[model samples]
Target: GTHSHGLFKKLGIPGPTPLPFLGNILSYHKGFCMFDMECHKKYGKVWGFYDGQQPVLAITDPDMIKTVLVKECYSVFTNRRPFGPVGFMKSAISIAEDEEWKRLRSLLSPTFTSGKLKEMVPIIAQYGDVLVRNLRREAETGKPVTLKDVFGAYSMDVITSTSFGVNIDSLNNPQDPFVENTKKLLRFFLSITVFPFLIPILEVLNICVFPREVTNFLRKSVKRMKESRVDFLQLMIDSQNSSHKALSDLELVAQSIIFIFAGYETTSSVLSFIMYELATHPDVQQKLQEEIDAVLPNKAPPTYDTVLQMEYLDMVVNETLRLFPIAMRLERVCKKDVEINGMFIPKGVVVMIPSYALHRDPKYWTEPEKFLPERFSKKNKDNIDPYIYTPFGSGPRNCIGMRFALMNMKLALIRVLQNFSFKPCKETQIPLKLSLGGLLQPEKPVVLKVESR
Candidate 1:
């Protein structure tokens, strides 16, 4: 059916033998990041595979990962992934590329500066109170709290309050349409990402991401953001420079969905895992809870400074990320030909940084598989290799909302720990079997017992 295709094979690159048309697509994912680990064991650091017709390099080398992310500018590897023109991506920070990425990042970057993020702390603390109450309700039932839903609502509330200036207490109002319609929201985003064929077809038919009704709600939120004073949204509006123009109403509307689609699940998923870990490891949980008690008295609420001051708190989050990276891998498309470790990365070829594998590499850790928060402690963290432990990725292409995401996570953890103690109850998973698919999440019904302190 086709001529000899030795392009990658001719170059002496070792990889899994690919089939016609689908190439290695069938086993490419083996369900999410599972395939990456399997391929690394089979073919060392850098191996070639095909995303159907296209060639891909599954790179796990530390030096090579740094170069792709840090040394080389965006020109060599520009586009985040190869999704053609699709709805929900228009002017969105993650989806936008090249000049568009530069401009949008410039305008949005200022809003995430440490100072600006501190200002948003009170807003998150307000939501953290709501989260604690939500968990308290579940504690009263004495049944395991469903983390995905409990934390999902809280994460959603934080995003809604921070980005859109919209007030949504999803924890209390469990049946809010905003919460109900989110299922469709995530499915729409995932299909466009995992199922490539649907991208162009959906775009061709002019079917956008939001279902018109959702679009209208987003528009109203944007309108509210513009009128609100000293808000994060207003700060973005004030960040317009000579080189960068403000985001248009339409762009802001869709970008709202982008944050909802991108930010919500990721933060919620990570937080769920962190709480689960705390519940299982009582010693670790007790240590962290003690730190919280030292800084925040019985009646005193958490401030930004107090939340970040806890050293052990950071270690727990880092250890959790080392084990369970949400993105699993960082995706990049080669822009121009480049050489690394005597190998050629031809322009137009896709490249991946297996952050999951690198974070767990034995060379970089004393005991990689075990949960050890001490690895990231101040005394030990400096000796660790750079670019080998990034959950939010590295360089210009790193996650833009990283600072904000971290702040929210830390704040929520503090509030929850202050009120309740999580434990390894009858509901907790013994070995913790993982779910199969695009992301590495705990298998369904991640139930936990939350008892008030």
Candidate 2:
């Protein structure tokens, strides 16, 4: 059943009018990011739009964000959209419903703890070395490297080995089934935006959007879980016998697939953007390199502790995230009718946090378009509010892999900076243009020249 249009009209929410069955789907012709920005600019901080017949509210006001995401989070807003991907993906922690989400989240949490993450550093660093070695062929030949092409494969190598206890070097074998299918899986998920109206039907039919090869390959990986190791998957496997709320075989497969997809693309995107920024801003790059040299000294390998010691590196990463958040929107489906700060929100409505719009707003930031890591410095950072600057999001339902992503990203950057430097070439976009895809990706590959330090 569709939401009655009278409700939004009565509530005085202003937005573009929707077509009969199409809703506001055509409004996204300029791309989701642009559409979000234009809507916020036109409708003010609060507005209502339709995601195919479904009424979705977009809120960029910081006070409202804090109330929805923190103050009234669990009681009123808990789950995301009702229907996401189908099959095993539906069972993933990111998409699983209330009780299931809690159980899977708790079970997976300990695997990414400080101690556990520290143990994974050596493996991550080894892959960092492989990344640098792989880049040598391009650097020596004086070729402009597409950052995602190299970084995506590097992240695939890291995620597979650290999370699944299986190792396949995608850099050496770019056409490997794992890499190919992962690419296919990402492209398949892009259809959700194109056909948001059909997802519930697909879920009802148990139709998985993932490539068959990827699904088969992951199922086979689950079968081999009985043979144990000290990776993330093994911890979940051990929990099966240790606890009552342990994951089943199918659940294990689901979690595994989510971990790969979640970790691979997002991490690579951050790396690619960071490199792009460093390439264009040489002064920042040089300062970052000086820190790396002082911290590591004599081309040393990075550990969890060493990476953490580089404060400048941390600030650089934060600034890049603020400028280019991986997930453009953070959404929560309203579970019950509620009123917050005198605004009425009814049950079955989705509340959208347009993070990209929030991040770039001149109201919250100074010189919003420029890359200034100093804004995140210890003294200056205190002036900012968490709700307004959410890169991994704010509160309990935020990204679980924040530490893991930061650890790996810092390590890779450290290793690369110790040996090489990035430079802008003819192909480099002076100001990167983001794609209209599901994630925040450069419309064209971020092509930059690389050279040995």
Candidate 3:
């Protein structure tokens, strides 16, 4: 295939020289995420590179990202290339494109509506209470808690209850086979996304890239779940019952698996980072606690109305997401040739929007490094551009579960704060370093002393 004519010639792309067969694989092996940052620094806003044989373009310009995400001309950019072992089953709404994607999105859209989400709130709150109870018990011993595992367990319980309508009590049974298997699933996803070429090889070999034990457990669980007469799984099964276009058993299984994987890991990571930030910034923590105390006195958990009423709490959550986005990168391929900042973006080239880089761009933000929730105040909000802050992404492809995720975070934080104050412990590593090739996670455990309120 000939390279698209316009932009490829205009702005010289960065990265190492492409060798025959190897292309830019050497550069990838050497730098990984750092390579992209370095290339952006060198080549400016829009630059091109290669991932092995494939041409990869990195776009940091806000205008370019907007055009790619919003304009219908860029519709062909819908598909996301799968990576890693489990990529074989990546046909959920996130990766599909064109008519196929449109159809799937339509089907899945109803699953995330406000009504459906409201129905799941009690279930989510049950797990939220469980998280608080577990933490309260741990606080009794005066032992510093590793919030990552606690948040991970809370997230698992939330996803499992809502997705499959089963109470795994991951908080109580950390070593449960299902909980352990789910953790491994997350590990595999991180490993494979960083080394995408492994996906094609696994596909060629006809090996099941999704772990056998995990798949078997899910298969059995869904089978047993289908026999039960309750909750969201029933909705999925009922949808299948009425329509020929219903989700297949395997599709149901895949969808449930994707929901759990996505719903748990990203949300948990965000909560961990949020907790770390609050622990380090005592002033911010005090302000948030004050807000929680005022709104939910007597240590009561948040109701939907009360949760919505907490303005400062909402700001804190938004600020946390801005600083530490769960999904650090977003990619869109050009559907049509378009000119941006004198550079013509050729059709079919991958355009990368790094949320991590963009969130901290000094050009768009004042004092970008500081943890200032007040920056989002109504009076000051006009100073910031909405397009530049996309923790949940922007436009149609933005995360569908944004409302649900936010509610869970707010509820969990409310309960935790009501009962205890988090202070950094000796194990708490300052200036957190994110793990490479993994989901946005602190390189070390986030240990915090839970002082009872």
Candidate 4:
């Protein structure tokens, strides 16, 4: 008798069968994007794939993806299996489920409110200036600069300052143990996720899969931050209003680690990509600089409100997100049996919403391969359905830190454009390629020559 998971009968899911032990691991290793794109092209919007015998569904349609993310019947999809030891210990709002997620979110929400985000403006602006000064100094020496590294340093400064009230200065001091440890953690996260089987084994052992040294560094950092009397660090330290007590030292370390990783990696990728696109499209860069110059007439750098008001900057950031979402795939597991597009999805099946595929799908975007920021203009934005553009996942589980992310990116962009004119360096690749093993990053240095304006 053939073993059946009831998936084919209920959902008309389509895909090649797994080869015993390997399952779809070989296909994924070759290329997740290429594999998923092939599946979508052959099987339409919804299809089935296996992650080591785990039934996984790939969904590309906006409407169906929305249903899976928002409907109560699909609640099971909300739970996330932690990828490593650090992930298991410090489950932030992103992976928490039901009551635990709700409680943590309630306590953390106030920390990211518009008012709170606004208060951090000075801190973000300060880092922006630091980044500009560092880049300018490098320009004078005519040394090749890796945009991702520079952005990584800038983001590290912002997160460390805001989350722990400590100044890491990773730009000048990349060898700082904290900065080095963070880079290792980022590399580890990308490696483990690409090889999902390792995650379960680590989970079973009840231990952090990351290097022992890295774990120890994080533990020490959290303890040190807690002992500091800084306002931001103290907020998390003192947040015991709910029935739940303040975050334990381990939990604080976990969340802090995640915050630094998320803050630096995504924003750095976006900013580097934005600069790459601008270099390739020089006229667009000039137009943007003109907007920045005019709106911010004072010699001083652009402020949070100034950047927000520059409609063109918003379009640029939105376009960058569309092209290269920090997290290329979004996954959710069904909580209860539910029907969508006339197909039943049983509880506990993982539903993957590939943001990369959907963003490029011709049905929702015009000249999808091109980089045209105008597509996000108010009038044009309304033409597309809201569900179609979700670089940040939507609804209750949408990224809580989006406000800070945007603010940080905008401030950094404003500073960079104000001081320098960027052009692609000799080593720049024409079409960007994400590094093979990690969160989305350019395969090589997004090298850009900077000159004083």
lDDT score, residue 116, model 4?
74
Candidate 4, overall lDDT?
0.74
The alpha-carbon lDDT assigned to residue 107 of candidate 2 equals: 83
Q: Could you give the candidate ranking by TM-score, starting with the highest?
A: 2, 1, 4, 3
Candidate 4 lowest-lDDT run of ten: 1-10
Runs in model 2 deviating more than 4 A are 1-3, 174-183, 186-197, 204-206
lDDT of 2 by residue, 1-453 (tens): 345555578788888887766678788777778888898889898998887677889988788998988888768887888555466677788888777787777888887789988888877887898899888778888868888877987888888676667666777876765566666665535446534767777777767667667788768866775654567777677777774467888888888778887888899999999999999999999999999999888987788888889999999999999999989899999999999877999888889999998888888899999999999999999988788888898877888888999998998899889989999999898888998878898888899999998
Query: What lDDT is obtained when candidate 3 is compared to the true structure?
Result: 0.73
Cα lDDT tens digits for candidate 4, 341-382: 777887667778877777778888888889999999998988
lDDT of each: 0.77, 0.83, 0.73, 0.74
- In every candidate, how many clashes are there? 1, 0, 0, 5
Task: Score candidate 3 by TM-score against the native.
Answer: 0.89
What TM-score do all the candidates reach, one by one? 0.93, 0.95, 0.89, 0.90
Best by TM-score: 2
Candidate 2 — worst ten consecutive residues by lDDT sum?
A: 186-195
Candidate 4: residue 192 lDDT (0-100): 55
What residue pairs are clashing in model 1? Answer: 76-335
Candidate 4, position 317, lDDT: 90
Q: Which 10 consecutive residues of model 3 have the lowest summed lDDT?
A: 1-10
Residue 122 displacement in candidate 2 (angstroms): 0.9
